[PDB]
Assembly symmetry: C4
Homo-oligomer: 256 residues x 4
Amino acid sequence: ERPLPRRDFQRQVWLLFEYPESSGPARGIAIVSVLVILISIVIFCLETLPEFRDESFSDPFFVVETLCIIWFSFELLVRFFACPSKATFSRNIMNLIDIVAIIPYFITLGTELAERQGNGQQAMSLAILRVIRLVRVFRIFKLSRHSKGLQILGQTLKASMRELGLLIFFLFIGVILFSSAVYFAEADDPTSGFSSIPDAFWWAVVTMTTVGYGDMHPVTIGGKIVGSLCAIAGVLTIALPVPVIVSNFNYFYHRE
Amino acid sequence: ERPLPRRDFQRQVWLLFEYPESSGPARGIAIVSVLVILISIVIFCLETLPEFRDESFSDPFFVVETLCIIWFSFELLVRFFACPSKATFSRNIMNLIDIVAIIPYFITLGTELAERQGNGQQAMSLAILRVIRLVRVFRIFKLSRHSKGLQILGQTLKASMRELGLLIFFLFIGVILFSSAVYFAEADDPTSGFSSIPDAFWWAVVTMTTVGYGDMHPVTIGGKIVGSLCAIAGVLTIALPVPVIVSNFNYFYHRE
Amino acid sequence: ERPLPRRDFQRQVWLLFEYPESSGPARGIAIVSVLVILISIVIFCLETLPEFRDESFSDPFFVVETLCIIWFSFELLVRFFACPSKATFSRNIMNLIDIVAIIPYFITLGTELAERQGNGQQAMSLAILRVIRLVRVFRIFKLSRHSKGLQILGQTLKASMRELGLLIFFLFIGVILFSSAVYFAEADDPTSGFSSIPDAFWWAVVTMTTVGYGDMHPVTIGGKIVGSLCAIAGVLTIALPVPVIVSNFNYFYHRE
Amino acid sequence: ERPLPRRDFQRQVWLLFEYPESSGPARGIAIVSVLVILISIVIFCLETLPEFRDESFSDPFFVVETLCIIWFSFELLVRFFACPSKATFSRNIMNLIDIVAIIPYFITLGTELAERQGNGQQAMSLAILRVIRLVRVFRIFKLSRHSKGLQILGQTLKASMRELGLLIFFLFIGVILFSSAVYFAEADDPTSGFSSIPDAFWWAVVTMTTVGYGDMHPVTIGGKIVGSLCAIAGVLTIALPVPVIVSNFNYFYHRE
Ligand SMILES: [K+]
Ligand SMILES: [K+]
Ligand SMILES: [K+]
């Protein structure tokens, strides 16, 4: 188990914010957290449309974000307020997700107020600002608190690291081998889409995995001879470590 | 078992219309029902061609439908006429399929006679009438009475609801994650098909499941780096709960 | 076992033409049959090129066929010459393959000599003559005499007829359902490739099985909503009876 | 086990160059070999770009190759210098990979110096020189010394030769059968991409394996009827001997 605060207000509060099975208020708090997470995801994925892109203070999009960040920060602060051991809090993982999901809103807001008002700046960089906007998407994983499915998935992926390594390794070797073969089989032809070996990598990964987008396909006979072998060998290299991961997931899931 | 009427005419009739193993007439009735269902499906799927679309009373298409509806209604009425318990009849499922397959023909016919003759109407709506035409397709499931395969499938799908939930959940998370990544990796380029994050959802679902229609594919290098990972992760998220459903079906089917 | 002729010449001959494990000559005869089969297949698949198509007596293509038919007929006649029981010969299957592979050459040749010389004819029909040319391809299955793999495959396919029926049935139901849904979701749009429900069948089969050729894909949002579900449900309906057939093949193959 | 030299310098040297678990220097040597292999692969795959292609002595690309070949030759020579039995050295496989990876650099260099200086030559041939450049790619397999994954893969592929034969055989039969059917179903149409049976082979292999590049697809109804059956039968013929190979790999990998 875990220690309990065994006190007057703090123990009651921590049982409220930690165990959704306790009472009516615990279920209410949990549903509130789920609703706010969903709202924030929709806001993030919606503000990127062509229509509102155009070319702050009262915009509809800029409000909702502040409300969601307020609620996340309040929840994190209260949850940390009554926590028995600090070492466990540091060693956890959900708290890392929460703090990472709260950081970017402070950085963006913080950066604009100080610099624009009292300095001349590029932005920072086109790349730097763009990079942050992307990190803002980790709010999905806050649903790990409310579903056993994601936690089972996390444990399965942690247990099976080595097989992931093997799968990527076999894919890499196959990609290099077949890219080289099909580039050299089509150098003499003028009308070929393969300009260099680093350009056939995309074709090799899209053919081994059986997606086959349809651009860059062989035309010479020597090209087709190799494009068949790539298709055949993709299945063989892909399907080797799948049973291990499926077995791990099934055991972790049906365990209880 | 089930109670039997244990009477003079009604018991004989219900044994005729319920158990196709009894006699010659039972087999004849069953084959008649199968023929009529097939005819009705062909009529529904055939009257939609470009040729007879053009821009009622004696049309070839409008007759056959009335005959099929007559036979379905007669069969349902007779089957319900001699039924021991009403609660079982309400709690069943095949009867729901039958009544749902009979409703739309009455609504369409019923609506035209009263309104056109004595009122001015839009139709109802373009959408409303169009919506009903689609519901007319549930006549296929009336074959659940005549094949063990469909009933095995129904039981398997009922038992494995949770794994279906998990599969859709993992797909949804993967879709959002990779759509966001590949939209942000291709914002700077002018010649890109991805205008907004809600526009990359189609690409993500068509790549994770390995269909790969071939429109909307990445062009920048940063786009290709992510389009490879989507292809790899689609297999992993798809192939997790398949063994459970296959095991359920195999057990339900080979049970007897 | 099987009866043996137990005689002077006929028993020796039948042991020569039936059991390739006996002696050196048996192995020589077997290799000769394999070489002739391969030659005939190459001739059939080669005479169809654009170059020799253009718009008989001494053509290179017309000779080789007569030689191969001569050898096949000689082998069949000798094999039947010393056969203990006639009922077994009729009830076999390899002999059916041999006679079916020998028939078309006689029909084509036979038809030209009598009719052209003494009558005026269309050909017979464009379709009739074309149909026969296709039947000429059953010469491949004569390799069932020389590989255990094909015979294992034949036994597996014979044992698992019912699961094949179920697979086709589920595919048919899924095809009709999703074709109807995606035709009705795209009637209002002008620029759609789906003209009628019988036209969406091709899209449904190419999407459920995850080939995805790339013509005929949805454009409206309502179309995409259904095109995702088709992709998901294809895997589910395809992957149900595969384990049974794989188990049958594995048992029949590893049995000995 | 294996014999040990049991001597003063040679035994110490062979333990250094053979067992990376011994000491610090053994780990250093192993990491050096890995770094050099990776460098050489990058050089080979990088010198083929459009930019440095243009239309030796001090080029950046021509140096690095000489350094890598020097190190490979030194390592091979030292490893062979202290080897107990010659028969084992000949019967090994890693040494074959090393000598094959060292040969091409000598041939290319050797050929240019003698012939250009004292003779007039074509090159040798466009094909001959091109063929060698391709063989230069076997440097990847030198990583078999430093990963258990590749060695497990080698043992699995050696054990399962027969199932590979069966898979290719079933694919070949299916390809011929469906190519013939879909060529004859589309001869009458003018606007068809299938000019001859040898031209439909590419379509058959790309459809059976479910890649589906998207050129060459059927247009007539008779063509679509067969293009569906090809898609269905590809899964059946592909998925038969996969369980055997997966079982072999799993046993060899989880053995220890
Ligand atoms: K696929
Ligand atoms: K495709
Ligand atoms: K595909």
